[PDB]
Design a protein around this ligand. Structure first.
Ligand SMILES: [Zn+2]
Lengths: 49, 49, 74, 50, 50, 246, 380
DNA sequence: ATGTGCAACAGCATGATCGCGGCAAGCTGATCGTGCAAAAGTCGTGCCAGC
RNA sequence: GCCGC
DNA sequence: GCTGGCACGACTTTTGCACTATAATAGATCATGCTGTTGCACAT
């Protein structure tokens, strides 16, 4: 919430202003950048279900 | 010496990161032998400690 | 003001579960649909929930039975 | 000529901003001996004896 | 910095783990390529130019 | 076709991240297009160059829901590709997701696998890394097949030896000194029979020196067959590129 | 250099592998979205708000029509009544008056947010703003009679109207005027107006390319010699850059040679030089010269900073030989400004004056030159 | 009694070497010409509608 | 890089 | 009658195709794994 969740930042700020104190976390952007980096080599890495 | 201390702490933390108390009682009868630490004519650690 | 949470810890002894119990009680008393069962002394919901746990009238089982009762009511 | 001279004077490891707190810091900085530099010894290459 | 000239060293005599002390000689010019002489643990004269 | 939330669907449930080699077909599947010009942007109009490292026909648009040439620049148009430019009206946040690729027109070897002390190619083909590096840089030839001639399967004959063989053997000598040669020799391998021969050699003869090498080689072989990867993919012919926004 | 500026603000991301990383900037649309996210809106209301704030221009005005917004939604029960309410709610954001359909609406909303007790609230709320705006554009002499009000009161109502912000939302911009002029073509004044070139960096590039490529090749650590592996790429790059600088310098020298008079004495002394004029001078095709001198910039003490502003083919059928319409436009601007307070500046009169001066130009062209960067001073 | 197989030693390449914060300082550029159809774009000029 | 812990 | 925004026939500009010898430089350990060469032990 505090660093990389682009939607999480706005959602948590909106909750704080409203007075909800709820998190609703997500996926940090840094992991997406790392995945794109590793995929930019000849290596495949994916988030399976 | 701070660099050596930091490297050692990093290695210890990583080698022991994934250890968690996940059970109430294993029920094993095994154990280790506890005796006060003696060395020549001097005592370092009594059994109580 | 709960400076120390020892009694609340001993009421439900894990030091980890009471965090979740107080979190859910504070959600009930803050989001809505609930009122404190202890006199409110201009305190935040967190310490009100902690005091309720300390007094012995809040725990996971009764929270679950109240949730079931409200679910069946509607 | 100008490029080399100005590159040495303006951008070098052994030509740094002088301290201006007190006259003592200026005096100390002016007569300062450094082991680093272009032809010197780097920080991590330094043993316990140097 | 180190003055140009000739320096003889013994590298503390702990390299081959046999207790044999190794002597080396270095010639350092102000500008140019270094020249070096070294002792093998089999007592052979070896140079390390540049 | 309104009230679409592609931001909410961006987050999906997942578990157990997995890693494997990427085939050229998979790299093409990731790609939204192919780049062919080296310059990133032109200074003529301060716009990304067509089919370049920084482009807008691929990688998505450059400024919100606008498109190049300004034919379709508004939110009313969605997912529409202009006739003048292949730019698609999109939230311009896909500059961090679309990958693209390049075609090499000549196979090259992955430095990830060839250059490492336990080299996977070298111990997968049971040859030293030195001669593999020599052939990969056109220093020497490597022959394949040639059963009729006296040349072996993994010969390391040099240029002079190649000329001598051409003068003497003439045909039947199939030797190449590029990455195509190593690719072909990796393709021609029959992996299951190789593993069976390894097992037979390991159990028949016992020696503390060759046992470790045979165990490592059979371990790599069984890992390759079970994992579903193809050893040809170690060398790559299609190279992906990073999104511009990263 | 007698006076030199201190170094301008600059930085580069350090102790971070993706060097220079980035830095987010807050624009008008981003601020509008941030404000929208913190007000109670329904899902349909949120969608309408996003759709209408996407259409906000840089100046803060709506570019697309409201009916076009309704069509953009493309859903039932989202008729214009709802989008009107949503837009009217949106207008009262931090840049009060943002997302306004027209000037009238902007002034109406700006005047709406007030104490409701100002001396001339109702005087200019609709009598001046919502009515007779075109009259207020002119001297508004008949506006006093039209609104049945004294001219003294209108003298303060006009000031009150002018006190409002004309273009709200343009005070939010975070862009920096860093679009300064490289002026790669420097020029000084001499006995023959010599032209030089700066910012070549060719010696620096040659030295760096040497010390990298030929430095590695001369280094004996690698087996063999990299006589063509690295050495024969720096040579190609240096030759290409030298050729580019050479043709740029040749084109610039041709340009100054044919345009010496523009720089000498009066400024408006440009000949109507065509691309073929320089093409024959440098023995090169016109397309390459056009691609070369189309955004290159020169640094002149008095002349303009461009290399395409001189390239005009505007013979205009001048009396004696040919002329350039740039000088004609400059003369028209100079003469129109220096005229009587009435300032007729009639198109026929201007054409007659130009013909008397020697510029045989039709009366319809002069109207175009005037309208390009000016308006007729009540010439109608 | 000479020849073949295997274990050990020396040389070589690879990887790593504590955090957090404040001044600071340099900018890391470009590229190429082609000569021609083919296209798009532009300018001097004349038109009708409003005052 | 210089300095502070 | 006077004036001010719209189109047309030459000119002008843009764009893909398209092939183009000299030199910074060497000042840590410390451990680990792999490769090539040599010496010790067994066989007909
Ligand atoms: Zn487009």
């Amino acid at each position: 919430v505090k660093s990389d969740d682009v939607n999480g930042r706005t959602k948590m700020y909106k909750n704080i202003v409203d007075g909800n104190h709820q998190m609703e976390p997500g996926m940090p952007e840094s992991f997406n950048v790392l995945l794109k980096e590793i995929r930019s080599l000849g290596i495949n890495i994916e988030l399976e279900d | 010496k701070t660099a050596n201390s930091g490297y050692l702490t990093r290695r210890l933390v990583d080698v022991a990161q994934d250890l968690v108390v996940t059970e109430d009682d294993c029920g094993t009868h095994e154990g280790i032998m506890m005796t006060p630490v003696i060395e020549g004519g001097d005592v370092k650690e009594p059994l109580r400690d | 003001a709960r400076v120390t949470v020892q009694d609340a810890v001993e009421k439900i002894g894990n030091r980890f579960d009471l965090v979740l119990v107080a979190a859910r009680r504070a959600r009930q008393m803050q989001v809505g649909g609930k009122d404190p069962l202890v006199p409110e002394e201009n305190d935040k919901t967190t310490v009100i929930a902690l005091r309720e746990i300390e007094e012995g009238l809040i725990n996971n089982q009764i929270l679950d039975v109240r949730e079931r009762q409200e679910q069946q009511e509607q | 000529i100008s490029a080399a001279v100005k590159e040495f004077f303006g951008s070098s490891q052994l030509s740094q901003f002088m301290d201006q707190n007190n006259p003592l810091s200026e005096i100390t900085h002016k007569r300062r001996i450094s082991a680093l530099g272009p032809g010197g010894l780097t920080r991590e290459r330094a043993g316990f004896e140097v | 910095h180190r003055s140009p000239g000739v320096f003889f060293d013994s590298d503390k005599g702990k390299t081959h783990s046999s207790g044999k002390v190794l002597y080396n000689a270095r010639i350092i010019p102000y500008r140019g390529s270094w020249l070096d002489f070294e002792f093998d643990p089999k007592d052979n004269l070896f140079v390390r130019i540049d | 076709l309104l009230k679409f939330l592609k931001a909410q669907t961006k987050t999906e449930e997942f578990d157990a991240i997995k890693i494997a080699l990427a085939s050229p077909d998979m790299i093409r599947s990731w790609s939204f297009g192919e780049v062919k010009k080296p310059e990133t942007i032109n200074y003529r109009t301060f716009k990304p160059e067509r089919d370049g490292l920084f482009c807008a026909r691929i990688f998505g648009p450059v400024k919100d829901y606008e498109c190049l040439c300004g034919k379709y620049k508004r939110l009313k148009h969605r997912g529409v590709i202009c006739e003048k430019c292949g730019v698609e009206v999109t939230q311009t946040k896909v500059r961090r997701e679309r990958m693209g690729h390049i075609e090499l027109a000549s196979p090259t070897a992955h430095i990830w696998f060839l250059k490492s002390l336990p080299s996977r190619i070298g111990l997968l083909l049971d040859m030293p890394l030195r001669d593999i590096e020599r052939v990969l840089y056109f220093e020497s030839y490597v022959v394949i097949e040639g059963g009729m001639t006296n040349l072996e399967r993994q010969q390391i004959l040099t240029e002079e030896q190649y000329l001598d063989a051409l003068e003497e053997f003439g045909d039947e000598f199939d030797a190449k000194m590029g990455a195509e040669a190593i690719q072909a020799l990796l393709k021609s391998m029959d992996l299951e029979q190789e593993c069976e021969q390894l097992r037979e050699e390991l159990n028949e003869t016992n020696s503390e020196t060759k046992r470790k090498k045979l165990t490592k080689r059979i371990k790599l072989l069984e890992a390759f067959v079970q994992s579903g990867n193809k050893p040809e993919w170690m060398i790559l012919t299609v190279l992906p590129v990073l999104p511009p926004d990263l | 250099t007698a006076g030199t500026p201190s170094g301008n603000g600059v930085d580069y991301q350090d102790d971070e592998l993706p060097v220079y990383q980035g830095e987010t900037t807050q624009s008008l649309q981003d601020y509008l979205m941030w404000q929208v996210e913190l007000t109670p809106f329904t899902d349909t209301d949120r969608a309408i708000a996003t759709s209408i704030v996407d259409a906000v221009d840089d100046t803060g005005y709506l570019t697309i029509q409201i009916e076009d917004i309704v069509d953009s939604i493309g859903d039932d029960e989202i008729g214009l009544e709802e989008v009107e309410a949503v837009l009217k709610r949106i207008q009262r954001f931090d840049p009060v008056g943002v997302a306004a359909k027209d000037l009238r609406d902007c002034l109406l909303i700006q005047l709406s947010q007030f104490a409701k007790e100002t001396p001339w609230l109702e005087e200019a709320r609709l009598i001046i703003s919502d009515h007779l705006d075109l009259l207020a554009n002119h001297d508004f002499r008949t506006l006093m009679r039209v609104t049945r009000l004294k001219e003294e009161v209108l003298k303060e109502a006009v000031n009150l109207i002018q006190s409002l912000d004309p273009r709200p939302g343009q005070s939010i911009q975070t862009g920096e005027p860093e679009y300064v002029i490289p002026d790669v073509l420097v020029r000084k004044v001499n006995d023959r107006w010599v032209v030089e070139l700066n910012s070549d960096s060719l010696p620096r590039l040659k030295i760096n390319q040497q010390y990298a490529a030929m430095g590695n090749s001369a280094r004996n650590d690698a087996d063999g010699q990299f006589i063509r592996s690295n050495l024969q790429e720096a040579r190609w790059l240096i030759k290409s850059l030298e050729s580019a600088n050479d043709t740029l310098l040749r084109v610039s020298r041709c340009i100054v040679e044919q345009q010496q008079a523009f720089f000498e004495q009066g400024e408006e002394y440009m000949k109507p030089m065509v691309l073929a004029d320089i093409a024959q001078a440098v023995e090169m095709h016109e397309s390459t010269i056009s691609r070369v001198t189309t955004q290159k910039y020169l640094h002149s003490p008095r002349g303009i900073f461009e290399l395409k502003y001189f390239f005009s083919s505007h013979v205009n059928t001048e009396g004696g030989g040919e002329a350039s319409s740039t000088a004609i436009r400059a003369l028209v601007k100079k003469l129109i400004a220096a005229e009587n307070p009435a300032k007729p500046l009639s198109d026929s009169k201007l054409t007659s004056m130009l013909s008397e001066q020697g510029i045989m130009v039709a009366r319809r062209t002069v109207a175009k030159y005037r309208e390009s960067l000016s308006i007729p001073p009540s010439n109608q």
